[PDB]
Design a protein around this ligand. Structure first.
Ligand SMILES: Nc1ncnc2c1ncn2[C@@H]1O[C@H](COP(=O)(O)OP(=O)(O)O)[C@@H](O)[C@H]1O
Ligand SMILES: Nc1ncnc2c1ncn2[C@@H]1O[C@H](COP(=O)(O)OP(=O)(O)O)[C@@H](O)[C@H]1O
Ligand SMILES: [Mg+2]
Ligand SMILES: [Mg+2]
Lengths: 288, 296
């Protein structure tokens, strides 16, 4: 069975931001979900569901997701984590405070993002930095091309000065959302084609000091950033390609060709990037 | 008065969104302000990057002078930088929920909530449940009128919205904010001298641009002059009728005179541009508005 969200009670007193589609607030299992629609003619909902589930299997706190129908559309339902007086403040907002940078908090220069993390006061700077790096590692595996400063952040309970890190959310930009059944069968059949979708792009939205988008493969097979390496060592063990392939297999609605596309691509991303980087990480770390 | 904010107490537990430059939360005179900095480019040789500060100050004050609820603004410096401090209204446990969010709820339109098609926005207004439609419509055309005098080229769906009490459940309309895109932000002393000399160049800034970010059903931006000297939308006309008598060109021209830092060529440019917008657009639109309400 596939879920039908159509007749779930709509909450008319809530909306959500973002430009990437419509959202409504609705009740399901007696709890609030942010239901994200696609733009009418949906690969963004799929990626959202698969990816967040993959992020959960990695032991990272992430929003809970479901796929289901709603009238004419396939949509991903995301458990609302800003009910009960919780409020979401993106990293973009927090970076906007870094006034001595003379950069907008929307700019994704890596060094600046890290500077912002080291100088902010919502969250223990060291805790937050481990989070950010955990996320980059999971975004590497997922091939996330859009982790802009607006796509992560913090919850503040109302009436307090207290922040926690918010569940990972919006992974809709992960796992090749642009790929047709047609694009799939082509990538699987052409080695130079698949290779390019590991080594060349998707690339990370974070940029180096020459303003060039960060290449996942080039970056973490060459980085000497002890925090990034450490996060590789933290997370690698929690990758479970069986659980992951199983997530993909049990994904509702999705076509078998697309499933096959994600199986192969996730494996390739796992071996071509994570493994190579992780094996180097051990090597340097054992170096005493 | 030019206020040095430099030693006011920072509040490190609050930040602010948007893409046009930095923001900090600080205490001034026992109250929280959102202090904005203009975006400073890597280089600004013979250009300005700093005008949005003044457009925000001067435009909000005019909106105040129009009797519409709007954020209080102060020009000042903070560590040797020009800023516009705007009294923080998401304090005392209010969240700002922008219209964009609300518009995102209108699934049946199959348009994104970022899209600014006028009929679609009017539809969102009629069908939302944050606020009595009638009250929201009125607020919306009042803002449009204000935005017509001020020449707002950027009233997108995230540049206005609602306040929700964190306690929660209910909304009121948020004060007008972000008027930084009004009053020819792209004008520097060179442009002002030019406009004040060449009337064709002033007229281009009356009849051709700025244009409303709002769009007609052909997907083009709404021209301020054409639209409200031609509209038969009763709600729009009714806002013109309410706002006209509140237009006090004295409070307005003084608001300008007493603006810090601005040059006498820039002050003169605003003085002139407001007279011109006031007479060529508003008066023209308002005169017809009176006429249509008449009887035989
Ligand atoms: N699980 C969630 N709970 C509560 N609010 C959320 C959740 N996910 C996203 N949001 C809010 O809704 C906005 C839109 O979600 P997002 O998935 O980023 O949509 P888009 O891709 O269209 O930007 C986010 O910026 C965030 O503020
Ligand atoms: N007066 C205010 N009080 C509290 N919060 C505000 C106020 N004005 C704006 N904000 C919040 O800060 C964000 C950025 O403000 P804005 O003036 O729109 O900056 P920008 O022009 O850089 O986008 C807004 O989207 C709004 O959510
Ligand atoms: Mg987003
Ligand atoms: Mg704004």
């Amino acid at each position: 069975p596939t879920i039908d969200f159509t007749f779930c009670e709509i909450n008319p007193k809530k909306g959500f931001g973002g430009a990437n589609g419509n959202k409504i607030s609705l009740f399901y299992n007696n709890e609030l979900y942010m239901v994200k629609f696609p733009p009418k003619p949906t690969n963004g909902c799929f990626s959202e569901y698969v990816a967040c589930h993959i992020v959960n299997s990695l032991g990272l706190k992430v929003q809970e997701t479901l796929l289901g129908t709603y009238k004419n559309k396939i949509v991903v339902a995301c458990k609302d984590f800003t009910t009960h007086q919780y409020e979401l403040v993106d990293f973009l907002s927090l970076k906007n405070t870094m006034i001595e940078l003379e950069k907008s908090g929307k700019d994704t220069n890596l060094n600046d993002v890290l500077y912002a993390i080291d100088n902010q006061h919502f969250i223990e700077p060291k805790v937050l930095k481990c989070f950010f790096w955990d996320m980059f590692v999971a975004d590497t595996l997922l091939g996330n091309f859009d982790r802009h400063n607006g796509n992560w952040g913090f919850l503040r309970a109302s009436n307090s000065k207290e922040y926690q890190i918010a569940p990972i959310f919006d992974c809709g930009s992960c796992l090749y959302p642009q790929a047709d059944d047609v694009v799939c069968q082509k990538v699987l059949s052409n080695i130079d084609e698949l290779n390019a979708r590991i080594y060349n792009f998707p690339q990370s939205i974070l940029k180096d000091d020459n303003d060039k988008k960060i290449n996942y493969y080039d970056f973490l097979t060459q980085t000497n950033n002890k925090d990034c390496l450490d996060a590789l060592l933290r997370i690698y063990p929690r990758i479970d390609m069986n659980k992951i392939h199983s997530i993909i297999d049990n994904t509702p609605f999705m076509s078998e060709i697309h499933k096959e596309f994600l199986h192969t691509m996730l494996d390739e991303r796992k071996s071509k990037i994570i493994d190579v980087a992780h094996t180097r990480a051990i090597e340097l770390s054992l170096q005493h």
